[PDB]
Amino acid sequence: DDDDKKTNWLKRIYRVRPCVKCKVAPRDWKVKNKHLRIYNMCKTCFNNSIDIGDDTYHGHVDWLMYADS
Ligand SMILES: Nc1ncnc2c1ncn2[C@@H]1O[C@H](COP(=O)(O)OP(=O)(O)OP(=O)(O)O)[C@@H](O)[C@H]1O
Ligand SMILES: [Zn+2]
């Protein structure tokens, strides 16, 4: 089932690339219509980035959660 290919890829993508800042914790994310938004940092590092005043690692990558556009 092609939807399963997409799901399995998104599981892998989420697992293998942790937070860009601490490089250990998984990333924060949200689901937004038919898309998965994976933010660049875990919540801990994101909250801290606000406290320290660094926007460098702010950002996200959106992913279609299904196989067919
Ligand atoms: N965990 C995270 N890692 C990296 N960037 C993040 C994370 N959470 C939020 N951001 C991004 O940091 C920026 C500042 O976030 P904030 O929530 O203060 O503003 P916002 O405009 O309400 O965010 P958004 O545009 O997502 O609604 C936004 O571009 C937001 O997408
Ligand atoms: Zn982190």
Structural notes for this entry:
There is one protein chain. The protein has 69 residues and is of the alpha+beta class. The chain has a single domain, classed as Nuclear Transport Factor 2, Chain: A (Roll). The chain is 36% helix and 20% strand. The chain contains two helices and three strands, in the order αββαβ. It has helices at residues 2-16, 43-52, and strands at residues 29-32, 35-39, 60-64. The protein has a three-stranded antiparallel beta sheet with strand order 1-2-3, covered by helices on one side. The relative contact order is 0.24. Bound molecules: adenosine-5'-triphosphate and zinc ion. Zinc ion is lined by residues 19, 21-22, 25, 41-42, 44-45. It is classed as de novo protein. The entry lists the keywords alpha/beta fold, bent ATP, non-biological protein, DE novo protein. The assembly is monomeric.
